[PDB]
Symmetry: D2
Subunit: 165 residues, 4 copies
């Protein structure tokens, strides 16, 4: 199916290809951030070898996923500066760490858009478990996916960054 693109389109890739703006992206090995369409398309998830879905915008159900050997968890968060997502940094990060402990695992962290809530949980994960500063973490994720945590989530990540340092 793939064919080598012509020059014009290769040049677009050098200029506009990165960070890519898509439904889902891998932001760290075996760790994907995506939107709702990606989480709901369960035939794609299973064929892509996915093993874990973390919904930072929990309704669908674990029965939707449990019929395919996918561990699900939903954090019931709103994408509003008045939601304290920091309440979930440690347990979401623990979920992600546990999943990535096994080599066979591939995890999708998602929300509606996959730009704010989910992004903030993966940032927190990288900080707590991969010894990253908030700046290093943002560089890791943002090069792979256009993300923008809301102003409140960002304040929360700054406070986590202060505690970790």
């Amino acid at each position: 199916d793939y064919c080598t693109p012509g020059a014009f389109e290769l040049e677009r890739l050098f200029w506009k290809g990165s960070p890519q703006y898509t439904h889902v992206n891998e932001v760290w090995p075996k760790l994907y951030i995506g939107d709702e369409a990606t989480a709901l398309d369960r035939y794609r998830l299973q064929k892509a070898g996915f093993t874990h879905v973390l919904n930072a915008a929990h309704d669908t159900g674990p029965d939707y996923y449990r019929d395919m050997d996918i561990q699900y968890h939903g954090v019931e968060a709103d994408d509003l500066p008045t939601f304290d997502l920091s309440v979930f940094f440690y347990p979401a990060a623990a979920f992600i760490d546990r999943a990535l402990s096994d080599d066979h695992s591939k995890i999708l962290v998602h929300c509606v858009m996959g730009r704010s809530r989910s992004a903030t949980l993966v940032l927190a994960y990288l900080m707590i478990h991969k010894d990253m500063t908030l700046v290093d973490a943002i560089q890791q994720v943002a090069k792979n996916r256009c993300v923008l945590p809301n102003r409140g989530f960002l304040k929360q990540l700054r406070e986590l960054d202060k505690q970790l340092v």
Copy 2:
């Protein structure tokens, strides 16, 4: 020493931070693409643990370092004498340059600098080729992997040369 920047500058990072325009960038684990300044600063290379330098602008008319320049430092050097010109056949160099990057990266301890004058065209082409040959990447995948870590733009001739390589490798991998 590191402190958490304010909200305004963290935002800048989300909007403008990727790819960064800097002298050198890690574009694959232990694999850096840098410019001439980076190649020349020996204190800073040694402090960072570089074990290999591939100079994609080798020669007394280009970036005139060579193995002698890194004497006593414990660096292995590979030199490709190339011009950043669409008429220059960088493709004869693709496999052996890549083989040098691959032998370096077999050893966990190694850390390799591939540079030219700007580290945007010559060195970038060699690393794209490396990724295509040794990491099973299409030209597209390879560009995405590098462009997200470093601003690069190989010249039109180098691109066509990468395209000719890409077609072969794709054909080969149908198998």
Copy 3:
């Protein structure tokens, strides 16, 4: 005072310079979108010749300036009391806010600041609407005009509100 930067930083400008992430940006002639700091710095507004301030985060619970804040400065003020929330109906404000921007921009001498807290969502939405209503732009054209001068991202609700406006104006312009 201004000097020509070196080659390396001029290159950065080509790769990373557009759009810039700054406090305020001109996004249409004499029309600026800025943040709260910009709205508050009166010395700097007056030095730059601002004649109009549209505060898209008006109110004592938001950016608490109002017309009194600009007393003696010769600024006309328009206040829209808005929350950056997808549930907030910014659309009732579209025509009269735009009418205020249009009356300012009729006079060559005028220079207008439209701001909110960050100048990314509330103020941006009002200016997109302005361009659509008074400069014959589609939502797409308006976004291209603003996004190339300022990093902006209206919230999902404001976007849907812009879409509802866009559909009407397009229908109207079939005529």
Copy 4:
């Protein structure tokens, strides 16, 4: 024909739309920079109301364009750091200024790719005739079109910037 795009695609526009990567773009009122396909598509140029083509990579011919009331000029430049494009800054800029003096005029400055040679002539134009520093000029053009003058052209523009200041 136009229809209002859905949310996903509007959001791509906020993130990746600017600067746009296309065949041609307007970089200053009535002043377009484009590639060769745009210059050769003469039915499009005429319907778009174009009045002037400046080819910074002059072969096609003025007979190709003179059959449609388009003033043509070709600068025979190579996109190589060893080409001194500065020899043409004043007369190319004069051509552009003369064209833009009339309100009815719309000018296309082009080369093969429309990224280096043509870009450098429009930058020089903005500096010589619109009182811009090289930095202001780059901001004007780069927000409208992905451009990158070659390292030699850039050195030449720095030297022009020094002379003008």
